[model samples]
Target: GVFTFEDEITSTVPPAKLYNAMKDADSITPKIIDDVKSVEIVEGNGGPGTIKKLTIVEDGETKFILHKVESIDEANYAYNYSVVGGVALPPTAEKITFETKLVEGPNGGSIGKLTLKYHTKGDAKPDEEELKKGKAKGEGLFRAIEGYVLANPTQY
Candidate 1:
């Protein structure tokens, strides 16, 4: 089963700043989130095709994943990436693709839009509860970054 979902968040942060905060999340996240061990570029620079190795400690276990960048439209504040390899992926999934866009809002705010494609094996469908939990995590992630950005007005 191939399922797609969408979620959005409105923030007081400007579009440019919000985009920058998300674009460099691999670096910014680890600094703020204690669970993340590290995020290092396995290949490529910062453009499309760049592969990053994400390491994190969850429940007293260290896990790693490999995700590849599809495209990063900096000028448009749009980004596309996919999970290529990892134990983090569910056994039912083939690959997960995510497309994120940060758009300008009225009153100097920004809107965060996220769309994910879940490519599952055979007729396997993702659990509704799992997807709901995943969405919550996404919301939490943006809020965490937003919190950091708001705290450090001097930084991106």
Candidate 2:
């Protein structure tokens, strides 16, 4: 099954800074989530064919494994990645793809849009409850970035 989720947040930072934080998804992903023990580049780090190592919750326990890349595009800032192990439903794994875009909002902050395409390995479909969980987690991603910026106060 395939599904999409969208979320928006206003940030005081400009588009460029926000885009930088958004584009660096690989680094930011694990940094932002406690559930994500770590995200490492097992093979190529830059783009397609890249292998991502993630230690995440599996059956309520942390499992480490690699996921291969299907595609990555920086221009539009999007990519497709799939689990390497072929581990039930969504086929025991899932493909996570997302993109971020920003524009000026009426509130004087940049409006950030985050979108995700979740592809399942098998016939498993994400229900409304699961959808909410995913959406909150995605939003937490941005919040983590925001919190980082607030604490650091440094822009690179």
Candidate 3:
């Protein structure tokens, strides 16, 4: 069975702005997010099957995450992606998938929901500590984006 969890977080940015910031992070993330060295689209044209290379520098070491876009729904502000290749993935996991949705919230803000799925090998279970670490990382990125968006009124 797959190990799965979903988290919902509130943001001060609107849904469209928040979604755009996430979808087009390369334009802004590396500049504001100190740990993020770069986000590159190695394959496809920002659509399904597109492969994104995410680079981060932590503890003076650089790491890469290869994520492939599975689906993107602009109208609904929903996105799905899979971690096909990455050193950050758990050693026992076969694949990691994430689904995200952004919706309008109170006072023109937005609520973001993320679902994480861990497909492990054999009977192995996903590491609880790793999942917790991942959640912290996700929230860190979210906060960074929200702060960037809020500070720059004209930007997405």
Question: Ranking by TM-score, best first?
Answer: 1, 3, 2
Question: What is candidate 3's lDDT per residue for 73-108, written digit by digit as tens?
Answer: 889998778887777777788878887889888888
- The alpha-carbon deviation from the true structure for residue 134 of candidate 2, after best TM-score superposition, in angstroms, is 1.5
Deviation (Å) of 54 in candidate 1:
1.2
Which candidate wins on lDDT? Answer: 1
If scored against the real structure, what TM-score would every candidate get?
0.90, 0.68, 0.90
Point out where model 3 deviates above 4 Å.
Answer: none
Instruction: Flag clash pairs in model 3.
Output: none
- Candidate 3 yields a Cα-based lDDT of 0.82
C-alpha lDDT values of all predictions: 0.83, 0.63, 0.82
Better of 1 and 2 by lDDT: 1
Candidate 3: worst 10 consecutive residues by lDDT?
Answer: 133-142
Quote model 3's TM-score: 0.90
